[PDB]
Structure 1
Amino acid sequence: IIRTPETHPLTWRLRDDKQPVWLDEYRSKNGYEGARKALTGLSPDEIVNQVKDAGLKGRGGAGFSTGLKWSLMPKDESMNIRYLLCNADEMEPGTYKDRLLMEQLPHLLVEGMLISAFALKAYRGYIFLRGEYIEAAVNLRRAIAEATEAGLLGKNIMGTGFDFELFVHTGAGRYICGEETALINSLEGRRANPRSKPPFPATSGAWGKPTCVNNVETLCNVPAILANGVEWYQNISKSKDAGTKLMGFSGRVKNPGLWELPFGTTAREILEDYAGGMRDGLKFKAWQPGGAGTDFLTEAHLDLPMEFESIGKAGSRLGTALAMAVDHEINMVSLVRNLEEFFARESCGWCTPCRDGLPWSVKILRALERGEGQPGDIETLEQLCRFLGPGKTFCAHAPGAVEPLQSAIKYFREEFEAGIKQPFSNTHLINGIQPNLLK
């Protein structure tokens, strides 16, 4: 792999010994130049317009436009207290990209938060980071200290009169905190229940103030845009989704890893050229494109490009674009049981369908795995997938929960029907009462 600054804007600064790049080495490799240009030559509205014109989309899994999200902030000049939050939670299973970004290139994240906070007029920034990323926390705190010593953080940054303070907030281990409104609730020191929208966080977010929540990779994509120009970012790939993206393959592949690729790279190219294909003696059965909350896809879907609309038309979600391969030796009932156990135990408990319908699916899948399935169980699972969709639950955790279950029932129904081996029995016989024998 040849990593040029124009083709790999996020990973070309990575060292060979997997060591973090500190302030002197980062600034030698054109570091904090986009920040200098943004803070000394552009209005915040101009930076927001440039980010919108670059077509930068959200890398957290939803794929929403970053410029459109930034433009929802109020034009009221009386609201001068504003917050930028970096979603470094990354608790979706199968996702390991933000760990690479913040363990080895923390100054890229710091520069991106600086540029985005100047664009959003955000006086404060918080990196909401998961507690298991200890090395990432150490590296981020050291990089923040180095940038504060060099005058890139704090009061009067670059002599421009802009004040910005960046904090690191380490999490306490819940998957629901990665959801943006639940992230805001967790940052306020509350139980991480999500919030209803409208109002959006751009109008009243963290402590009622205007707040923008962005993924680590989006904020890491910002400085390359503002240092190389909008037309460079628009010309990375000839696809509807501009720029690069960290894509990878995990599972029982020969080379599980992570590579920076343009949008439009097919899944077979990532699986064969980069991941090295499956291991010896293993036959490719299925794959998940973007984490635990995405629909399963078959081998015939490996030829379509890894874009938002291409995967979306296939019946799945691009997600984090960190695919996971499933070989023929993996029982799909056991795998979906494991997935639903994760999703049911990571429910925040706010709303009824997720909280009380995911455990029912878990118990049905446990019975199917043990061969104690009963008639009507697959119908119950299908109705649970139907009734836990978007809009029926309070947040998007339960639709993501039911995507793999419905996709596996659609593509591997023969494994689920094999678990049904006993007749349906909900009642025991009561002596003296003749039962109502329904037909």
Structure 2
Amino acid sequence: KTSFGSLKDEDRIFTNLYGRHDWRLKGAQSRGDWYKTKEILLKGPDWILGEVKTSGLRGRGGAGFPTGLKWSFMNKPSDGRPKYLVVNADEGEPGTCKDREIIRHDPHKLVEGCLVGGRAMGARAAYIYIRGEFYNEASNLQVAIREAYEAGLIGKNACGSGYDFDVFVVRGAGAYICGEETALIESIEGKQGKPRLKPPFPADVGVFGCPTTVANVETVAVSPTICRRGGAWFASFGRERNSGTKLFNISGHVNNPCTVEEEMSVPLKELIEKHAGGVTGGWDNLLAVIPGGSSTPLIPKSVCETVLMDFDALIQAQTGLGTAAVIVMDRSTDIVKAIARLIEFYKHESCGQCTPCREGVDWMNKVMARFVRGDARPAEIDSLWEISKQIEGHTICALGDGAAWPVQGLIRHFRPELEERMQRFAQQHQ
């Protein structure tokens, strides 16, 4: 296959994405959830890990680590400590609202994914660290978890398989860094959400000191569909090493801002002009697209014509796929104000632990706040470039990377506009 996209409704994993069907247990069973879960649990951990490794599923959190290779790190005998699945449900990324829709409208798919994933890794329970701001979504998930305990689908003797598995929901308290996996693990432990260093990885020392996998909502909820439909079905979509379907969050300057599931290697132009009603003012009104959420660098309009919406094609476009949350910006946008507001986000959402993020992200915000007005001179663009390179790669987690990257994309694709901003400031203020 060469052309990707136009995903048919029979291949949608996340049916009832829009709230149009019943989200509860009787509606989830009538759409395919909890079907033959006892057989999936009885076929063992190695079979489920083989079905995830066959499927080519990469981590939907945004980094794209291979899911079966990641979960096989827990496939080891116990050392006295319990094992845990921890389901990452924070989703603080600007642009991104897909995990909100999965928790809110398909909660039993997430709970069955907790059961299947924690079966595959020998995990005792599942801690769904949901975002604290998603209160109605968290109570929604708790109603579904009560329906799953009352039906015998989880808990003592889950689905009749003899494998005991609890599911807990831990609510956050308003910290974007508590979606980072080690900071999330520390936030579950009752501490400040400060990221641990790596190594130890969570498969060695995770939550409470136990072996742990931290996985996104979307990479957990697709796993019962992968284990029912087969890994070859899921690997039949997208390019090679870019398999599956992906939820896309098209927001910003589009006609119909939507959440949609689409095939993996779909073009960006096809996605925006099909599911979002196109850019406001036409495709010629397009200025730039932040492809996959705020951490990824933007791409200008010339790159958006041909680029595919998977990991490798966006890496070749010197950006990333990320959360696949498409932020569309038209020609009427002060792009320096938008990227400086994005860096203002990244200094308000920064835990202060290591020196490069704590100091340099505030310093990049001050330089970008001067760049909006133009209160600078064009040596400071290269200064800010080197400051972004000093933050990038030198931090504890990837929020330093995620703050340095939009500055780098803005400089790389809009240095002349920054320069003319500063020179009109210089001429009308002197």
TM-score (norm 2): 0.93
Matched, 1:224 2:225: yes
Given the alignment of the two structures, is residue 4 of structure 1 paired with residue 20 of structure 2, yes or no? no
Return 238-247 or 260-269, whichever deviates more.
Answer: 238-247
Matched with 2:3 is: none
Mapping of residues 345-356 of structure 1, within 5 Å: 345-356=348-359
Q: Do 2:7 and 2:263's aligned partners in 1 also have CA atoms closer than 8 Å?
A: no
1:298 Cα deviation (Å)?
1.1
Q: 2:247 aligns to what SS in structure 1?
A: strand
Does the Cα contact within 8 Å between 1:74 and 1:210 map onto a contact in 2?
Answer: no
Q: Is the 8 A contact 2:364 2:387 kept in 1?
A: yes
2:403 is the counterpart of 1:398: no
3-state SS, counterpart of residue 301 of structure 1 = coil
Deviations along 1:179-219, whole A, 9 cap, x unmatched? 00111011101111111111210011111110000000001
Q: Which amino acid aligns with 1:298?
A: P
**Worse overlay, 257-266 or 17-26:** 17-26
Which residue does the alignment assign to 1:376?
379
| More displaced stretch, 186-195 vs 159-168 | 159-168
Distance 1:80 1:191, change over 3 A: closer
Match of 2:250 in 1: 249
Tell me which moved more, 31-40 or 195-204: 31-40
Instruction: Report the Cα offset of residue 126 of structure 1.
Output: 0.7
CA contact (8 A) 2:7 2:262 kept: no
Structure 1 stretches of at least 4 aligned residues deviating more than 6 Å after TM superposition: none
What SS does the aligned partner of 2:64 have? coil
Q: Could you tell me whether the CA contact under 8 Å between 2:339 and 2:407 is conserved in 1?
A: yes
Q: Which amino acid aligns with 2:246?
A: K
Deviates more, 1:373-382 or 1:188-197: 373-382
Distance 2:7 2:68 in 1: 31
CA positional deviation for 1:74: 5.6
Identity of aligned residues (%): 41
Q: Distance in 1 between matches of 2:241 and 2:320?
A: 16
State the TM-score, normalized to the length of structure 1: 0.91
Q: Deviations over 1:238-289 (max 9, x none)?
A: 5432211012321111111111111110000011122111223781100011
Q: Which has the larger radius of gyration?
A: 1
Provide the rounded CA distance (Å) in 2 between the counterparts of 1:96 and 1:168.
19
Q: 5 Å matches for 1:399-418?
A: 399-418=401-420
Q: How far apart in 1 are the matches of 2:51 and 2:336?
A: 47
Cα distance 1:419–1:143, how it changes in 2: closer, same or farther (>3 A)? same
How far apart are the structure 2 equivalents of 1:2 and 1:399? 33
2: CA distance, partners of 1:341 / 1:308: 27
Structure 2, unpaired ranges of 5+? 1-5
Distance 1:70 1:46 in 2: 12
Distance apart, 1:3 and its partner CA: 5.3
CA-to-aligned-CA distance 1:22-64 (integer Å, 9 cap, x gap): 1112112222125222123x01122122211221110000000
> 1:96-135 maps to which residues of 2 (within 5 A)?
96-135=97-136
- Provide the rounded CA distance (Å) in 2 between the counterparts of 1:294 and 1:101: 23
Q: Select 1:385's aligned residue among 365, 370, 388.
A: 388
Deviation at 1:377, TM superposition (A): 2.0
- Match of 2:206? 205
| 1:27 maps onto 2:32 in alignment | no
Rounded Cα–Cα distance in structure 1 between residues aligned with 2:231 and 2:238: 13
Which of 301, 320, 323 is matched with 1:320 structurally? 323
Contact 1:388 / 1:402 at 8 angstroms: preserved in 2?
yes
Q: Is the 8 A contact 1:37 1:227 kept in 2?
A: no
Cα distance change, pair 4–79 in 1 and its aligned pair in 2 (3 A): farther
Q: Which moved more, 1:88-97 or 1:329-338?
A: 329-338
Q: Contact (CA 8 Å) 2:293, 2:327: kept in 1 or not?
A: yes
Pairwise CA RMSD:
1.8
Distance 2:111 2:83 in 1: 17
8 Å CA contact retained: 1:248, 1:270: no
Amino acid paired to 1:295? P
Contact 1:88 1:98 in 2 (8 A): yes
Deviation per residue, 1:390-421 (Å, 9 max, x gap): 2x111110111111111111111122223435
Number of residue pairs matched by the alignment: 418
Matches within 5 A, 1:27-46: 27-40=29-42, 42-46=43-47
